[PDB]
Structure 1
Amino acid sequence: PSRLRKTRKLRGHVSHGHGRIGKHRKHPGGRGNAGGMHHHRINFDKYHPGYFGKVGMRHYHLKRNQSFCPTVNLDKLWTLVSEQTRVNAAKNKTGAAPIIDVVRSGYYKVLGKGKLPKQPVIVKAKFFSRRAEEKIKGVGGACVLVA
């Protein structure tokens, strides 16, 4: 909406909001990211630190799907199964332990961040974390691997 913009209140003022002493010239600093090392150094150092130089090893033919590994935390682990699976193990008495298959939900690694509810589980996953496996033993449960 032009009728809401700022160039509709700027009709009648000579410099159109841009200065009498210093005009609105075209490119009074160069175009783009020019002068990153010479006359825009205070800005490229106060606001984009580390923008100049190399670091690390190159990797020519990088394919972003060899390193695919989406993780799920223990806090929201019990959200992969339905609700009548977590409560059925509550009402359960024969000690049976529901099998939570994670790679079926779409995660490969299991990281252990949250607390767990006191009931056994059988977590099938591709990769496990040390703590994610200890928080599962400490509640009673098995960490199955699936290639």
Structure 2
Amino acid sequence: PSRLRKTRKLRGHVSHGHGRIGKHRKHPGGRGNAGGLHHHRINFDKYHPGYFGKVGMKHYHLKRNQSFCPTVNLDKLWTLVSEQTRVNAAKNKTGAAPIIDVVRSGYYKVLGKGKLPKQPVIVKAKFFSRRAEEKIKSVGGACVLVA
């Protein structure tokens, strides 16, 4: 909607909202990121530190699939199975724990943020963190590995 814009209100104002002294010229200051080291150095230093230079080792032919490894924390672990699964384990007189296969749910590594409910469970994953295995062990569960 062009009717809602400043241009419809700036009719009759000679400068069109751009000043009489300094006017609206073509490109005062260069085009794009011009002069980021000379006359826009203050803005680049103030708001984008680290912008200039190289850091680290360059690696050619980076395949993002090789390092694909999504993670899920212990607090979202029990949502990977059904609601029926958890309650059936909690009321199970037999100490038979369910199996949570996080590879099936699309995750490879289990991280250890949060806390687990007090019921054992077998967790299958490609990787675990040290605190993740510690907390799964502490509820009587087991950490097993897959490939």
1:91 is displaced (CA, Å) by 1.0
SS of aligned partner of 2:8: coil
- In percent, how many aligned pairs have the same letter? 98
SS of aligned partner of 1:144: strand
SS of aligned partner of 1:45: helix
Distance 2:37 2:116 in 1: 53
SS of aligned partner of 1:143: strand
Counterpart for residue 110 of structure 1: 110
Counterpart for residue 41 of structure 1: 41
Distance 1:49 1:61 in 2: 28
C-alpha distance after superposition, 1:62-116 (max 9, x if no partner): 0000000000000000000000100001110110000000000000000010111
Distance 2:59 2:71 in 1: 24
Distance 2:63 2:83 in 1: 38
C-alpha distance after superposition, 1:9-64 (max 9, x if no partner): 00000000000000100000100000000000000000000000000000001000
Is 1:76 paired with 2:65?
no
TM-score by length of 1: 0.99
Tell me the matched-pair count: 147
Distance 2:68 2:129 in 1: 16
Distance 1:90 1:134 in 2: 21
Distance 1:77 1:61 in 2: 34
Which is helix-richer, 1 or 2?
2
Distance 2:68 2:93 in 1: 39
Distance 1:137 1:144 in 2: 11
Contiguous gaps of at least 5 residues in structure 1: none
Distance 1:94 1:2 in 2: 71
Distance 1:2 1:124 in 2: 58
SS of aligned partner of 2:45: helix
Distance 1:87 1:37 in 2: 63
Distance 1:137 1:143 in 2: 7
Distance 2:128 2:54 in 1: 34
Contiguous gaps of at least 5 residues in structure 2: none
